[PDB]
């Protein structure tokens with residue numbers, strides 16, 4: 001399969017977990033991949049492994065909450081490549097705190113900061129590059145963007161906000177030929193609130209979120225925009 | 239590129255339009271295809287064109303509202319092939335009638351009968367075959383399953399019913415390894431094929447809101463169906479995927 | 489409180505359960521109530537109890553799946569009263585069957601027949617009366633109109649269909665001044681578990697009065713800018 | 729009608745517009761009302777008009793983006809009253825910017841800051857008082873929390889975030905007897921003047937803008953025992969917009 005053949009793909013949070021798996025899967029589908037993470041060492045380790053397999057890949061440190069660093073990366077991509085075919089906003093954090101605890105404030109600030117504000121930073125900064133290539137954006141949402149589930153308030157809200165960001169980015173960028181979608185994973189390999197309701201009675205394998213991301217990023221989804229696709233084993237239908 | 243390699247796919251309403259395109263697209267992805275349509279001659283003409291191109295396909299008449307005929311087809315499939323890998327419930331009709339008109343009743347009965355009751359008939363009858371193969375089901379939902387849009391009451395309700403049917407079939411069939419999903423298209427080009435049936439202004443409800451400002455190509459609805467029916471969707475069930483140019487997000 | 493002062497309210501399935509409670513609550517809010525049920529003896533018993541309490545009520549047998557009987561009632565209402573201020577489609581049934589069982593077909597036909605086809609029959613037939621009064625409609629949906637929960641396929645589908653019916657009725661009847669809404673209850677005190685209780689935020693079954701109050705609200709001028717809407721009354725179930 | 733009889737109700741952004749009208753409508757339903765607004769003179773002016781009509785009300789200046797100011801108010805309410813029966817998070821702002829413009833950043837920050845971060849600030853600070861009274865919360869969401877409509881990105885996102893906040897606050901505060909809900913207005917007469925209207929009007933089935941009192945009534949309903957089995961819920965008050 002070559003669903004992303006010769007496409008330039010940027011994946012944030014690519015040092016481990018789903019982001020690294022999405023980076024590897026995009027390369028397997030023919031993409032050249034830019035892997036970025038707050039842990040630059042991890043991003044470069046993942047990129048060097050792809051390179052060692054004959055893929056075209058590079059890795060860099062990037063804190064998505066640093067608007068100056070995001071702008072620098074955006075200028076760099078535009079200057080070296082002239083555009084960006086796919087942006088995957090995968091960088092995220094979570095936390096543990098009930099709403100009625102003082103701990104909820106610091107957890108809220110941290111999670112909102114990365115999951116929502118960082119996704120806005122990278123999304124807004126990469127618009128010129130996405131315009132030049134008529135690329136598309138895939139956000140990492142969550143089933144927590146539709147129900148509260150068992151995640152902390154900052155996480156639920158950040159993912160509900162990403163759901164809305166998908167819609168309004170799609171609206172504003174559609175005139176420029178840019179599609180914007182999201183996946184909403186349930187629990188993926190990377191607990192009661194999810195297992196009671198997941199129809200498949202199993203957590204997802206990382207490859208099973210990779211394939212829907214690649215689909216949405218590909219011409220198979222060329223009439224799909226503003227859409228959040230559950231990848232959740234039936235969780236939200238239960 | 240063979241997402242459905244050697245898989246047996248049954249498509250209803252496959253004699254024309256989107257159903258025929260889903261059938262061809264499945265074959266191009268490696269599937270053996272059973273095409274059925276109320277017009278059996280049309281289903282056979284579509285199947286024969288696939289056979290001439292080297293694919294493996296067959297066509298039959300099927301009235302999805304006839305439970306006896308649906309059961310006969312299911313028994314035939316189980317007996318001849320031992321199972322069914324993909325069911326696509328595409329057969330469907332629409333209509334024009336406002337809720338306050340007497341005409342709304344005949345339209346409602348007809349549309350509910352084909353779109354919802356037919357989809358239930360075919361889905362329920364093929365469960366044994368789907369269990370044997372651990373196959374999956376893709377329903378044809380609609381943007382009208384989420385909002386009223388411009389469609390007649392029977393159509394809106396049939397597609398909202400299909401959305402719920404997706405969820406409860408997914409729940410009850412998950413222990414048998416059967417995924418159940420749906421696509422929710424806006425207007426695609428096959429629905430514009432007959433000119434005299436395109437009333438002036440008739441697509442404004444959709445065109446005024448769709449973000450891409452165009453009717454979808456028929457192949458752009460085929461590809462998401464194939465995706466949902468494939469192992470790329472192996473962790474997706476109970477899910478209804480809009481394929482609508484951004485209509486429902488607007 | 490007189491949220492439905494002098495309004496005429498028709499409640500289907502009012503012989504017992506939520507329909508009888510909605511009928512009583514509507515009368516308490518000032519309404520004249522027509523109570524109908526396939527069990528006409530129960531409908532008349534509920535109506536006569538309301539009459540004995542000093543309210544204005546009447547009861548009749550009605551099978552909502554019988555289009556001829558539904559039309560006769562709609563004609564009687566238009567002739568005797570000139571219009572209808574509120575229609576509450578509450579009549580409903582349920583059943584038990586998994587989708588892969590042969591029994592699912594009989595359950596499907598029975599449940600679709602009352603819950604969806606019956607609601608269509610009554611809704612469509614009462615449009616002339618609703619237009620004359622600029623009345624409104626409240627359907628009984630369910631949390632099962634949004635997720636599969638633990639209900640049988642025919643029930644789940646019937647309630648998702650009611651959700652859509654709410655939307656397209658609202659669209660077509662808005663130009664005539666008719667609002668159309670629905671409540672989506674969780675599990676209520678009635679003929680009626682873990683699938684719900686593990687998820688309900690309030691960790692209890694709803695009281696019947698707690699579905700009556702939202703129905704009265706939607707039927708009242710408090711909801712004069714609300715149409716096409718389905719209001720969960722579910723202790724938080726759908727938000728969990 | 730006394731749906732909120734003797735209940736203490738705090739309304740943010742109550743200096744004008746919907747917040748002022750919710751404050752007045754709550755007082756009409758028997759509530760004692762605390763009105764707060766970044767313009768404290770306006771909040772006190774609205775409170776004094778209610779006091780003149782025989783209701784019990786007070787006004788204060790409050791910037792909902794100032795966490796120390798919010799904490800002081802929460803302390804004052806808890807100390808003086810021992811609890812809070814209703815919190816209405818109404819304070820909000822909007823703005824004009826498309827996502828691909830540089831102006832979208834400053835609009836985003838400003839709108840997120842009031843609409844989402846302020847609603848969080850007030851909601852989290854008032855939890856002790858809400859616990860002591862088993863009060864409830866009504867957020868001001870929007871049809872924009874469900875579809876993109878015509879609003880700027882920061883507004884759409886802030887209201888979808890409010891939608892999710894309703895759900896997770898309801899989950900965490902249900903053990904303490906606190907319901908949390910929201911209304912989702914469409915276009916209402918007020919700052920329908922810095923958006924212009926046709927994105928809402930094309931889809932609004934009633935083909936009219938909602939009157940202010942038609943949003944007040946559903947807010948009062950959700951804040952009252954009529955909604956005692958309703959939590960985590962976002963109620964559209966939109967003329968049919970989201971059903972179209």
Ligand SMILES: NC(=O)c1ccc[n+]([C@@H]2O[C@H](COP(=O)([O-])OP(=O)(O)OC[C@H]3O[C@@H](n4cnc5c(N)ncnc54)[C@H](O)[C@@H]3O)[C@@H](O)[C@H]2O)c1
Pocket residue numbers: 012013014015016017018019036037038039042062063064065089090091092093114118140141142143184185186187188189190
């Ligand atoms: N794993 C799941 O079950 C699941 C479910 C739903 C959604 N998601 C979403 O998938 C995405 C990835 O999840 P994961 O399980 O791989 O998480 P993970 O914590 O394993 O990986 C997150 C990655 O993002 C990076 N990161 C954190 N903060 C950053 C910042 N400021 N700038 C740049 N990079 C940063 C981390 O270094 C890490 O490499 C997240 O957005 C998460 O919310 C995951």
Ligand SMILES: NC(=O)c1ccc[n+]([C@@H]2O[C@H](COP(=O)([O-])OP(=O)(O)OC[C@H]3O[C@@H](n4cnc5c(N)ncnc54)[C@H](O)[C@@H]3O)[C@@H](O)[C@H]2O)c1
Pocket residue numbers: 500501502503504505506507524525526527550551552553577578579580581602606628629630631672673674675676677678679680
């Ligand atoms: N009780 C709950 O937990 C709950 C939850 C969600 C939704 N609902 C819905 O609320 C409505 C009332 O439920 P309930 O619990 O009071 O049920 P119930 O069975 O106690 O009452 C239903 C009433 O409808 C009548 N009825 C049945 N078939 C009829 C027909 N063909 N014509 C006329 N009347 C008929 C019955 O005789 C009965 O009086 C139903 O639509 C139900 O689906 C109930």
Ligand SMILES: NC(=O)c1ccc[n+]([C@@H]2O[C@H](COP(=O)([O-])OP(=O)(O)OC[C@H]3O[C@@H](n4cnc5c(N)ncnc54)[C@H](O)[C@@H]3O)[C@@H](O)[C@H]2O)c1
Pocket residue numbers: 740741742743744745746747764765766767790791792793817818819820821842846868869870871872913914915916917918919920
């Ligand atoms: N989305 C929609 O369709 C829609 C339409 C109208 C109103 N609304 C919502 O209703 C609410 C009220 O709207 P409105 O039309 O009355 O707005 P408005 O501009 O008329 O009034 C808003 C009030 O909030 C106050 N305020 C602003 N920033 C503040 C801060 N940092 N701290 C405290 N107070 C502050 C202002 O002083 C003002 O009095 C808002 O949340 C708004 O988003 C939504």
